[PDB]
């Protein structure tokens, strides 16, 4: 069937000092896919990791092609946009919705950790939604392998986004990969339930963070969060990564298992 490999780029989905993402529509089938265009003027590693991914809560990777200095990455199109835009400033979103999104985020993270991959930059801007509002973890440009041949590799590279980064990244030379992603998921949960980020960064120098360690939950954003989910956040946002709750235990949390959301 001629023309089936032709795609028209009809809309800009993203743009930054790195390249852009365009919505591509198949000339014949009208199928919609996202095309990441990067000028190799890093990408190799991102592609390598994307080739390992196959999960309903992770942006699907269809393949790639390069023409000289430009690399084209064909990725799953999530028409619902970024989770970031479903969060109402200073309000958040309905708890049931947040719980559903959190369940899907955990599913995706469990999957990634299961194959030894850590995302390292989990935040609402990198969590996309499909037409049925299903969450998809996106952008593996900062991702890396932390387990290979059943052997764990401690990380040392400082990366991510400050408001979402775990404290050990700023205090220790080396650290385990998994607790760092768990922490970021905790910050995302806080954002979904309060519509605001708790601190600029998890440092003792940051007043907001010191207040949290001092358990002053009568202050924002904590006072806007119900007791059940707040109890979970108390277990996730723990400074010592070794004492921080693991995903298997997050799955056993009272709030995590509370019936709240009706089916579509």
């Amino acid at each position: 069937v001629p023309f089936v490999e032709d795609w028209d780029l009809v809309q800009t989905l993203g743009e930054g000092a790195y390249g852009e993402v365009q919505l591509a529509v198949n000339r014949v089938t009208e199928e919609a896919v996202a095309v990441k265009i990067v000028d190799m003027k890093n990408i190799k590693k991102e592609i390598c990791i994307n080739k390992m991914l196959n999960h309903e809560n992770v942006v699907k990777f269809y393949g790639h092609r390069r023409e000289g200095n430009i690399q084209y990455l064909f990725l799953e199109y999530c028409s619902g946009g970024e989770l970031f835009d479903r969060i109402e400033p200073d309000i958040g979103m309905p708890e049931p919705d947040a719980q559903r999104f959190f369940h899907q985020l955990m599913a995706g993270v469990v999957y990634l950790h299961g194959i030894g991959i850590t995302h390292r930059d989990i935040k609402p801007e990198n969590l996309l939604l499909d037409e049925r509002d299903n969450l998809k973890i996106s952008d593996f440009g900062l991702a890396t392998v932390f387990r290979y041949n059943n052997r764990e590799r401690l990380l040392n590279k400082m990366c991510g986004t400050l408001p979402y980064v775990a404290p050990e990244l700023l205090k220790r030379r080396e650290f385990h990969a998994e607790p760092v992603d768990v922490w970021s998921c905790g910050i995302v949960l806080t954002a979904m339930l309060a519509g605001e980020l708790p601190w600029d960064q998890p440092s003792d120098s940051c007043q907001e963070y010191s207040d949290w360690k001092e358990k002053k939950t009568y202050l924002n954003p904590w006072k806007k969060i119900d007791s059940a989910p707040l109890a979970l956040l108390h277990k996730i946002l723990v400074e010592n990564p070794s004492a921080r709750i693991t995903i298997p235990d997050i799955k056993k949390d009272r709030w995590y298992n509370k019936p709240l959301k009706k089916g579509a």
């Binding site: 032709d6 028209d8 780029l9 365009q22 092609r65």
Partner: peptide
């Protein structure tokens, strides 16, 4: 703009 798969 357009691209080929």
């Amino acid at each position: 703009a357009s691209v080929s798969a």
